[PDB]
Design an enzyme around this catalytic site. Structure first.
Site, PDB file in Angstrom:
ATOM      1  N   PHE A  63       0.827  -1.198   0.000  1.00 17.13           N
ATOM      2  CA  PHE A  63       0.000   0.000   0.000  1.00 17.13           C
ATOM      3  C   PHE A  63       0.870   1.261   0.000  1.00 17.13           C
ATOM      4  O   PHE A  63       0.357   2.377   0.063  1.00 17.13           O
ATOM      5  CB  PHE A  63      -0.930  -0.009   1.211  1.00 17.13           C
ATOM      6  CG  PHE A  63      -2.041  -1.021   1.124  1.00 17.13           C
ATOM      7  CD1 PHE A  63      -2.230  -1.784  -0.019  1.00 17.13           C
ATOM      8  CD2 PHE A  63      -2.904  -1.203   2.195  1.00 17.13           C
ATOM      9  CE1 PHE A  63      -3.279  -2.712  -0.095  1.00 17.13           C
ATOM     10  CE2 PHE A  63      -3.939  -2.131   2.135  1.00 17.13           C
ATOM     11  CZ  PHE A  63      -4.130  -2.881   0.989  1.00 17.13           C
ATOM     12  N   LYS A  64       2.184   1.070  -0.076  1.00 19.45           N
ATOM     13  CA  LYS A  64       3.130   2.190  -0.172  1.00 19.45           C
ATOM     14  C   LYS A  64       2.729   3.361   0.715  1.00 19.45           C
ATOM     15  O   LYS A  64       2.593   4.517   0.280  1.00 19.45           O
ATOM     16  CB  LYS A  64       3.327   2.591  -1.627  1.00 19.45           C
ATOM     17  CG  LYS A  64       4.213   1.542  -2.306  1.00 19.45           C
ATOM     18  CD  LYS A  64       4.648   1.917  -3.673  1.00 19.45           C
ATOM     19  CE  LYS A  64       5.264   0.727  -4.339  1.00 19.45           C
ATOM     20  NZ  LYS A  64       4.335  -0.438  -4.462  1.00 19.45           N
ATOM     21  N   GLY A 178      12.778  -5.407 -16.444  1.00 18.58           N
ATOM     22  CA  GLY A 178      14.138  -5.639 -16.912  1.00 18.58           C
ATOM     23  C   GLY A 178      15.109  -6.275 -15.938  1.00 18.58           C
ATOM     24  O   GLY A 178      16.231  -6.623 -16.322  1.00 18.58           O
TER      25      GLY A 178
HETATM   26  O1  LIG Z   1      10.201   0.077  -6.495  1.00 16.18           O
HETATM   27  C1  LIG Z   1       9.071  -0.639  -6.618  1.00 16.18           C
HETATM   28  C2  LIG Z   1       8.179  -1.026  -5.480  1.00 16.18           C
HETATM   29  C3  LIG Z   1       7.017  -1.842  -5.759  1.00 16.18           C
HETATM   30  O2  LIG Z   1       6.335  -2.390  -4.767  1.00 16.18           O
HETATM   31  N1  LIG Z   1       6.762  -2.297  -7.048  1.00 16.18           N
HETATM   32  C4  LIG Z   1       5.607  -3.060  -7.433  1.00 16.18           C
HETATM   33  O3  LIG Z   1       6.009  -4.470  -7.589  1.00 16.18           O
HETATM   34  C5  LIG Z   1       5.208  -4.953  -8.720  1.00 16.18           C
HETATM   35  C6  LIG Z   1       5.947  -5.151 -10.011  1.00 16.18           C
HETATM   36  O4  LIG Z   1       5.190  -5.934 -10.867  1.00 16.18           O
HETATM   37  P1  LIG Z   1       5.783  -6.331 -12.268  1.00 16.18           P
HETATM   38  O5  LIG Z   1       6.608  -7.588 -12.112  1.00 16.18           O
HETATM   39  O6  LIG Z   1       4.505  -6.567 -13.113  1.00 16.18           O
HETATM   40  O7  LIG Z   1       6.615  -5.192 -12.876  1.00 16.18           O
HETATM   41  C7  LIG Z   1       3.961  -4.093  -8.717  1.00 16.18           C
HETATM   42  O8  LIG Z   1       2.908  -4.501  -7.940  1.00 16.18           O
HETATM   43  C8  LIG Z   1       4.457  -2.763  -8.359  1.00 16.18           C
HETATM   44  O9  LIG Z   1       3.563  -1.819  -7.902  1.00 16.18           O
HETATM   45  C9  LIG Z   1       7.558  -1.961  -8.225  1.00 16.18           C
HETATM   46  O10 LIG Z   1       7.337  -2.517  -9.411  1.00 16.18           O
HETATM   47  N2  LIG Z   1       8.819  -1.193  -7.987  1.00 16.18           N
END
Ligand SMILES: O=c1cc(O)n([C@@H]2O[C@H](COP(=O)(O)O)[C@@H](O)[C@H]2O)c(=O)[nH]1
Ligand SMILES: O=c1cc(O)n([C@@H]2O[C@H](COP(=O)(O)O)[C@@H](O)[C@H]2O)c(=O)[nH]1
Lengths: 217, 218
Positions: A63-64, A178
């Site tokens: 929920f950041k 990536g």
């Molecule tokens: O620095 C951050 C912190 C996050 O929680 N997240 C989160 O982790 C997930 C990444 O998902 P994805 O593998 O589809 O890119 C998402 O739920 C996203 O909000 C992020 O991608 N980078």
């Protein structure tokens, strides 16, 4: 925290039917699901108890949290009431805001994860320059769980250096953004994977593939 | 810009539907703009936005302090506007791509983004304050028209108003409980946000009326 296969599913699908189906399809590979606002705002906080009923998985509420201390306390309370085991909190709003979350977590049994540096390009503008200091603040506050970026393994390694090997570190940005699973696990305890699994043609095969990739880890 | 009745926005952070509905109804003759955040939404569901619209005339600002990566930000904005929010509040500290993601959804869906620059609590001094002037400048460059800044630091609120210009819309929390003064804050903000000093009052209508009396000349 003990995460099965060092793999946390980021369940960001936005309808209950798809989210439950996909999670069910990959359930044998995980025991930890990160549930965020895309799902919760689409389907309600009751979705957390439902995941526990169906899968008996650990639930991290992503929920950041990034409000003032008083509001942070309320957010943590509502979140843990819904059955989340842990909550992810931003460090950028400062120590008092983090402490408010730590207080509620202590009261209700749960864990706080401190988000230091983020994985997306925009994190370079403001967050990255503050991130080491945010991590040190976590250490000072007794934070034991952290989140750092798969997309910048040198920054993830630095975060690990700051918090030490005893702290728990999870890392998103693997796959779609990536980051490489194996490299990320040099430094993080677990990887977070969303789209590379839940948007895959075959989410089960995708999950199995990730585990294959990191099999000797 | 949105026409905020009496320059006064209610921060409705009560966590149960019955009390939240009661208090909002009691102040509705004084306030037509309500800020709904996660304390209420995580307790009662996004349908609370619908219930507020149904019961009261009120504009709804979803104070979700959106602070994720662009892809997730887009999803949050979509869900929030789908539920009926007029506007959403987004953090600037995660950078320009994250803000742009929200602006793009707001543009497509015919709604508004508010950019949160500096925050009102003590912890804001650690990291946010040093970045806030640049966050605000970034907002202006991105075409953000609506902003949030802190009543508790008049000098900072004044600087934020300078950066964004007189044409931008600026709302400001920290009035009352956190120590900010209503009149002083309105030197720079278009509207003040007030939570506890209204919703914890024995008579929230009287509390709202009192705030309005104190700013009547403005
Ligand atoms: O620095 C951050 C912190 C996050 O929680 N997240 C989160 O982790 C997930 C990444 O998902 P994805 O593998 O589809 O890119 C998402 O739920 C996203 O909000 C992020 O991608 N980078
Ligand atoms: O810098 C900020 C930004 C906020 O949105 N807010 C918020 O505005 C409200 C302040 O309420 P109160 O009047 O009870 O102090 C809360 O909903 C809170 O989360 C804040 O206090 N300071």
């Amino acid at each position: 925290m003990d995460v099965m296969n060092r793999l946390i599913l980021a369940m960001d699908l936005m309808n209950r039917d798809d989210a439950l189906r996909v999670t069910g399809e990959v359930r044998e590979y995980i025991d930890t699901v990160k549930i965020g606002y895309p799902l919760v705002l689409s389907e309600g906080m009751d979705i957390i108890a439902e995941f526990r009923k169906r899968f008996g998985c650990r639930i991290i509420a992503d929920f950041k949290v990034a409000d003032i201390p008083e509001t942070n306390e309320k957010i943590c309370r509502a979140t843990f009431k819904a059955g989340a085991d842990a909550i992810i909190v931003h460090g950028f709003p400062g120590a008092d805001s983090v402490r408010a979350c730590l207080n509620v977590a202590e009261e209700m049994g749960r864990e706080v994860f401190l988000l230091t540096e983020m994985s997306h390009p925009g994190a370079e503008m403001f967050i990255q320059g503050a991130a080491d200091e945010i991590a040190r603040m976590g250490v000072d506050l007794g934070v034991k769980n952290y989140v750092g970026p798969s997309t910048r393994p040198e920054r993830l390694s630095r975060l690990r250096e700051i918090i030490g090997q005893d702290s728990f570190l999870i890392s998103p940005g693997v796959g779609a953004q990536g980051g490489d699973p194996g490299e990320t696990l040099r430094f993080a305890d677990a990887i977070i994977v969303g789209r590379s699994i839940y948007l895959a043609d075959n989410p089960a095969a995708a999950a199995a593939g990730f585990i294959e990739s990191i099999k000797d880890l």
